[PDB]
Amino acid sequence: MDLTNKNVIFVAALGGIGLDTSRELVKRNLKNFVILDRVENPTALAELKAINPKVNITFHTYDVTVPVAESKKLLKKIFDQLKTVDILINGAGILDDHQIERTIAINFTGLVNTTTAILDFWDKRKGGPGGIIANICSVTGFNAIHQVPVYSASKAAVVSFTNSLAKLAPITGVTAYSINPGITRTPLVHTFNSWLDVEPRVAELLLSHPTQTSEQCGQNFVKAIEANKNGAIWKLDLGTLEAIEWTKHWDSHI
């Protein structure tokens, strides 16, 4: 798909992977780039606006742990201005297995709730135009980092949820694919809590293995968006972009 003149909403665009993805995205001559993020970052906004003055960049404070009704309210405001939105990127994520409930609320529930809210505007059953959802999941949704079992389980959830969304496309009009980075040097992984501190040095041990930069990650992210393959499960690991095949262990037949 061609990003020229598209309207994009990116939830959690100002994080480490987000920001480097965002720098590449706004190079593509979007019409509108809507950033939804919990925490203002004024420096990153100015930087992004610097790169490509043609793009209209707007920022709205958004916490993905709000109720679906609050998401719908905010999204109505955005559709009211923009009329159409082509792509939603769900990128919010924390890594701290001391915060069990909060990990699941942000990494899993909130992504489902934002998706659920936007379907109100996109669902072809309601007359909507359909749309495209890019979900930032994680290779730990494939195979856990088992010293952070909660984080990894929340990401296994959103890989599954994204697979299912992609299979609902003929009914809803909304296609979907997951973006699953391998270990990427950002503030997320520099220091973090393991579950019941089974491994207090998890961050040190993790970064003694090969990693990628957020710029490598960001570059491959935009390529996967431009590939626009419904149901792809993209692995972005050590600077490459690869589609994995999900194992069929069981089939519901429906």
Ligand X SMILES: CC(=O)Cc1cc[n+]([C@@H]2O[C@H](COP(=O)([O-])OP(=O)(O)OC[C@H]3O[C@@H](n4cnc5c(N)ncnc54)[C@H](O)[C@@H]3O)[C@@H](O)[C@H]2O)cc1C(N)=O
**Beta strand 174-181 with 131-136: parallel, antiparallel or unpaired?**
parallel
Q: How far is CA 138 from its chain centroid? A: 9
Q: Encoding tokens for residue 131?
A: 């749309």
Which residues share a beta bridge with 56? 32
62 is catalytic: no
CB of 154 to a second copy, least distance (A): 6
Residue 192 in contact with residue 95, Cβ under 8 Å?
yes
Per-position x/- string for 187-206, each x denoting binding to ligand X as judged by CB under 6 A, each - no binding:
xxx-----------------
Residue 152 binds to a second copy (criterion: CB under 8 A): yes
- The verdict on whether residue 30 carries a ligand-binding annotation is yes
Residue 186 binds to ligand X (criterion: CB under 6 A): yes
Q: Encoding tokens for residue 217?
A: 């990650």
Residue 224 binds to ligand X (criterion: CB under 6 A): no
- The verdict on whether residue 17 carries a ligand-binding annotation is yes
For residues 25 and 32, give the distance between their C-alpha atoms in angstroms, rounded to a whole number: 11
Beta strands in the chain (DSSP E): 7-11, 32-37, 56-61, 87-90, 131-136, 174-181, 184-185, 212-213, 233-237, 240-243
Residue 218 binds to ligand X (criterion: CB under 6 A): no
For residues 149 and 139, give the distance between their C-alpha atoms in angstroms, rounded to a whole number: 13
Q: What is the CA radius of gyration of the chain?
A: 17
- The verdict on whether residue 24 carries a ligand-binding annotation is yes
Stretch that binds ligand X, among 1-9, 11-19, 47-55, 125-133 (CB under 6 A): 11-19
Residue 92 binds to ligand X (criterion: CB under 6 A): yes
Residue 1 binds to a second copy (criterion: CB under 8 A): no
Residue 246 binds to a second copy (criterion: CB under 8 A): yes
Query: From the list a second copy, ligand X, none, which binds 192 (C-beta under 5 to 8 Å, kind-based)?
Result: none
Query: From the list a second copy, ligand X, none, which binds 251 (C-beta under 5 to 8 Å, kind-based)?
Result: a second copy
Across the chain, how many H-helices and E-strands are there?
Answer: 9, 10
| Per-residue CA distances from 253 to 165, 170, 173, 210, 250 (Å) | 17, 17, 22, 40, 9
Stretch that binds ligand X, among 10-18, 24-32, 126-134, 195-203 (CB under 6 A): 10-18
Q: Pick the catalytic residue: 121, 122, 151, 195? A: 151
Residues that bind a second copy (CB under 8 A): 68, 100-101, 104, 108-109, 112-113, 116, 119, 123, 139-147, 149-150, 152-161, 163-165, 167-168, 171-172, 182-183, 195-196, 198-199, 202, 205-206, 209, 235, 237, 244, 246-254
Residues making up the annotated binding site for NAD(+) are: 10-33
List the catalytic residues.
151
